[PDB]
Design an enzyme around this catalytic site. Structure first.
Site, PDB file in Angstrom:
ATOM      1  N   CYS A   1       0.914  -1.154   0.000  1.00 45.96           N
ATOM      2  CA  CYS A   1       0.000   0.000   0.000  1.00 45.96           C
ATOM      3  C   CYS A   1       0.962   1.215   0.000  1.00 45.96           C
ATOM      4  O   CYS A   1       1.832   1.244  -0.875  1.00 45.96           O
ATOM      5  CB  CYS A   1      -0.987  -0.014   1.175  1.00 45.96           C
ATOM      6  SG  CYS A   1      -0.257  -0.368   2.798  1.00 45.96           S
ATOM      7  N   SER A   2       0.918   2.137   0.974  1.00 44.48           N
ATOM      8  CA  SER A   2       1.919   3.209   1.001  1.00 44.48           C
ATOM      9  C   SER A   2       3.109   2.788   1.922  1.00 44.48           C
ATOM     10  O   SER A   2       4.225   2.545   1.445  1.00 44.48           O
ATOM     11  CB  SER A   2       1.283   4.528   1.439  1.00 44.48           C
ATOM     12  OG  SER A   2       2.235   5.582   1.424  1.00 44.48           O
ATOM     13  N   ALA A   3       2.852   2.641   3.224  1.00 41.78           N
ATOM     14  CA  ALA A   3       3.859   2.206   4.199  1.00 41.78           C
ATOM     15  C   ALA A   3       4.086   0.708   4.138  1.00 41.78           C
ATOM     16  O   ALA A   3       5.111   0.248   4.629  1.00 41.78           O
ATOM     17  CB  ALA A   3       3.430   2.599   5.618  1.00 41.78           C
TER      18      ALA A   3
ATOM     19  N   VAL B   1       1.899  -1.467   5.620  1.00 42.66           N
ATOM     20  CA  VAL B   1       1.491  -1.987   6.933  1.00 42.66           C
ATOM     21  C   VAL B   1      -0.007  -2.095   7.149  1.00 42.66           C
ATOM     22  O   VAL B   1      -0.499  -3.164   7.548  1.00 42.66           O
ATOM     23  CB  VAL B   1       2.244  -1.317   8.141  1.00 42.66           C
ATOM     24  CG1 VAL B   1       3.744  -1.467   7.999  1.00 42.66           C
ATOM     25  CG2 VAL B   1       1.886   0.160   8.329  1.00 42.66           C
ATOM     26  N   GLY B   2      -0.710  -0.995   6.857  1.00 42.05           N
ATOM     27  CA  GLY B   2      -2.141  -0.843   7.102  1.00 42.05           C
ATOM     28  C   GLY B   2      -3.040  -1.719   6.283  1.00 42.05           C
ATOM     29  O   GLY B   2      -3.499  -2.751   6.758  1.00 42.05           O
ATOM     30  N   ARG B   3      -3.298  -1.303   5.044  1.00 45.85           N
ATOM     31  CA  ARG B   3      -4.121  -2.045   4.096  1.00 45.85           C
ATOM     32  C   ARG B   3      -3.475  -3.376   3.723  1.00 45.85           C
ATOM     33  O   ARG B   3      -4.193  -4.336   3.454  1.00 45.85           O
ATOM     34  CB  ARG B   3      -4.387  -1.205   2.854  1.00 45.85           C
ATOM     35  CG  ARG B   3      -5.262   0.013   3.099  1.00 45.85           C
ATOM     36  CD  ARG B   3      -4.924   1.105   2.099  1.00 45.85           C
ATOM     37  NE  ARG B   3      -5.698   2.322   2.306  1.00 45.85           N
ATOM     38  CZ  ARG B   3      -5.654   3.391   1.508  1.00 45.85           C
ATOM     39  NH1 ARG B   3      -4.891   3.391   0.427  1.00 45.85           N
ATOM     40  NH2 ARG B   3      -6.377   4.468   1.787  1.00 45.85           N
TER      41      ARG B   3
ATOM     42  N   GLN C   1      -2.852  -1.299  10.784  1.00 45.39           N
ATOM     43  CA  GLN C   1      -2.347  -0.122  11.470  1.00 45.39           C
ATOM     44  C   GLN C   1      -3.347   0.667  12.318  1.00 45.39           C
ATOM     45  O   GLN C   1      -2.943   1.313  13.292  1.00 45.39           O
ATOM     46  CB  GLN C   1      -1.597   0.749  10.462  1.00 45.39           C
ATOM     47  CG  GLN C   1      -0.587   1.695  11.072  1.00 45.39           C
ATOM     48  CD  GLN C   1      -1.011   3.117  10.875  1.00 45.39           C
ATOM     49  OE1 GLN C   1      -1.281   3.561   9.755  1.00 45.39           O
ATOM     50  NE2 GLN C   1      -1.084   3.863  11.959  1.00 45.39           N
TER      51      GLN C   1
HETATM   52  C1  LIG Z   1     -13.326   4.506  18.318  1.00 44.99           C
HETATM   53  N1  LIG Z   1     -12.995   4.476  16.890  1.00 44.99           N
HETATM   54  C2  LIG Z   1     -13.913   3.663  16.122  1.00 44.99           C
HETATM   55  C3  LIG Z   1     -15.308   4.280  16.014  1.00 44.99           C
HETATM   56  N2  LIG Z   1     -15.897   4.198  14.674  1.00 44.99           N
HETATM   57  C4  LIG Z   1     -16.230   2.841  14.294  1.00 44.99           C
HETATM   58  C5  LIG Z   1     -15.552   2.448  12.992  1.00 44.99           C
HETATM   59  O1  LIG Z   1     -14.543   3.009  12.590  1.00 44.99           O
HETATM   60  N3  LIG Z   1     -16.238   1.396  12.365  1.00 44.99           N
HETATM   61  C6  LIG Z   1     -15.970   0.739  11.159  1.00 44.99           C
HETATM   62  C7  LIG Z   1     -16.808  -0.301  10.729  1.00 44.99           C
HETATM   63  C8  LIG Z   1     -16.547  -0.973   9.530  1.00 44.99           C
HETATM   64  C9  LIG Z   1     -15.449  -0.616   8.749  1.00 44.99           C
HETATM   65  C10 LIG Z   1     -14.611   0.419   9.175  1.00 44.99           C
HETATM   66  C11 LIG Z   1     -13.496   0.810   8.365  1.00 44.99           C
HETATM   67  C12 LIG Z   1     -12.555   1.156   7.694  1.00 44.99           C
HETATM   68  C13 LIG Z   1     -11.413   1.559   6.951  1.00 44.99           C
HETATM   69  C14 LIG Z   1     -10.940   2.867   7.089  1.00 44.99           C
HETATM   70  C15 LIG Z   1      -9.817   3.283   6.381  1.00 44.99           C
HETATM   71  C16 LIG Z   1      -9.157   2.374   5.552  1.00 44.99           C
HETATM   72  C17 LIG Z   1      -7.999   2.828   4.813  1.00 44.99           C
HETATM   73  O2  LIG Z   1      -8.045   3.120   3.621  1.00 44.99           O
HETATM   74  O3  LIG Z   1      -6.857   2.875   5.536  1.00 44.99           O
HETATM   75  C18 LIG Z   1      -9.631   1.065   5.396  1.00 44.99           C
HETATM   76  S1  LIG Z   1      -8.776  -0.106   4.322  1.00 44.99           S
HETATM   77  C19 LIG Z   1     -10.156  -0.948   3.535  1.00 44.99           C
HETATM   78  C20 LIG Z   1      -9.643  -1.803   2.429  1.00 44.99           C
HETATM   79  C21 LIG Z   1      -9.824  -1.422   1.101  1.00 44.99           C
HETATM   80  C22 LIG Z   1      -9.329  -2.235   0.064  1.00 44.99           C
HETATM   81  C23 LIG Z   1      -8.658  -3.417   0.389  1.00 44.99           C
HETATM   82 CL1  LIG Z   1      -8.048  -4.446  -0.862  1.00 44.99          CL
HETATM   83  C24 LIG Z   1      -8.486  -3.765   1.726  1.00 44.99           C
HETATM   84 CL2  LIG Z   1      -7.679  -5.216   2.136  1.00 44.99          CL
HETATM   85  C25 LIG Z   1      -8.977  -2.965   2.758  1.00 44.99           C
HETATM   86  C26 LIG Z   1     -10.761   0.653   6.115  1.00 44.99           C
HETATM   87  C27 LIG Z   1     -14.867   1.093  10.375  1.00 44.99           C
END
Ligand SMILES: CNCCNCC(=O)Nc1cccc(C#Cc2ccc(C(=O)O)c(SCc3ccc(Cl)c(Cl)c3)c2)c1
Length: 286
Positions: A223-225, A227-229, A267
């Site tokens: 992904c970028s780093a 680590v995350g995705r 991450q």
């Molecule tokens: C107290 N804090 C929490 C409160 N809020 C609840 C909450 O967040 N629920 C909740 C419930 C369900 C899902 C989520 C999320 C998320 C999310 C955010 C940013 C990124 C990102 O792009 O980094 C991603 S990656 C997605 C991806 C794309 C393509 C591939 Cl191929 C893959 Cl593997 C993975 C995922 C959050």
């Protein structure tokens, strides 16, 4: 932290979502600290000759699991790439988890692909996201480009709603020797908010994972780093393979294990919850 049956997993998701998602927070805090006392070294990552080879100063490649480039005529640090071997389901070193390459690491990146006999690239980022540079374009827009001794030709592009498949033909000039590398590039990145729908990610994971042919090298995931995705894809893929094989799930257990292989895999807490959502949808896809 033992393999939970799919039915219990579903009930366990309910427990995690209750009380303003505190169970998820506790699980993720447990993942964040699991390697704290392990003194896992990343000496090569911090060496001054390798500093410009790291996309982020704090995103390191653990010594014990790092992918070593086969020494290059000369240098002492020509073996370094910010990349780690990462286990998959019933397959040790099933992946290479790496950062999005830099212009200064394009040669190392392609050489690692060649040397590792990698046939699949999983790109889980856009080059630029929210006006920020996430990854550099390590492949030719069209036709051919040379990256050190590696000659790379774009053979075909297939654009889908949420991802792109690019087939490349790679060949080492200074040396089978002509090979196919398939890049699965996830392109749907929400301009605001966070994902949203797990179904397109599920299709991307399933189709990119089914493309792994025997007996090839590890699937390169970045992904970028890196680590995350990257970690997110690795956990989803491994867990879908466990579900099919044994109808059991071990997200926390498998994640804590992969955290020993590369720092910060999965991450954020959001990515950690996302895994559970994606896995629930796959289990439900019956
Ligand atoms: C107290 N804090 C929490 C409160 N809020 C609840 C909450 O967040 N629920 C909740 C419930 C369900 C899902 C989520 C999320 C998320 C999310 C955010 C940013 C990124 C990102 O792009 O980094 C991603 S990656 C997605 C991806 C794309 C393509 C591939 Cl191929 C893959 Cl593997 C993975 C995922 C959050």
């Amino acid at each position: 932290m033992e393999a939970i049956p799919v039915k219990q997993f579903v009930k366990h998701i309910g427990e995690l979502y209750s009380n303003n998602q505190h169970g998820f927070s506790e699980d993720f805090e447990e993942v964040q600290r699991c390697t704290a006392d392990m003194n896992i070294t990343a000496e090569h990552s911090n060496h001054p000759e390798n500093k410009h080879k790291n996309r982020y100063i704090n995103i390191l490649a653990y010594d014990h699991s790092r992918v070593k480039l086969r020494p290059l005529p000369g240098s002492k640090h020509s073996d370094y790439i910010n990349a780690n071997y990462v286990d998959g389901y019933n397959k040790a070193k099933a992946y290479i988890a790496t950062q999005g390459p830099l212009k200064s690491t394009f040669e190392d990146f392609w050489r690692m692909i060649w040397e590792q006999n990698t046939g699949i690239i999983i790109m889980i980022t856009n080059l630029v996201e929210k006006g920020r540079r996430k990854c550099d374009q390590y492949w030719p827009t069209e036709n051919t480009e040379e990256y050190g001794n590696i000659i790379v030709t774009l053979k075909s592009t297939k654009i889908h709603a949420c991802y792109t498949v690019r087939r490349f033909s790679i060949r080492n000039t200074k040396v089978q020797n002509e090979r196919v590398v398939i890049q699965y590039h996830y392109t749907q990145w929400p301009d605001m908010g966070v994902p949203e729908y797990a179904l397109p990610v599920l299709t991307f994971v399933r189709r990119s994972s089914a493309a792994r042919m025997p007996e090839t090298g590890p699937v390169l995931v970045h992904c970028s780093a890196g680590v995350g995705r990257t970690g997110t894809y690795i956990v989803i893929d491994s867990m879908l393979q466990q579900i099919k094989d044994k109808s059991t799930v071990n997200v926390l257990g498998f994640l804590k294990h992969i955290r020993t292989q590369r720092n910060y895999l999965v991450q954020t807490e959001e990515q950690y919850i996302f895994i559970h959502d994606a896995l629930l949808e796959a289990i439900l896809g019956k």
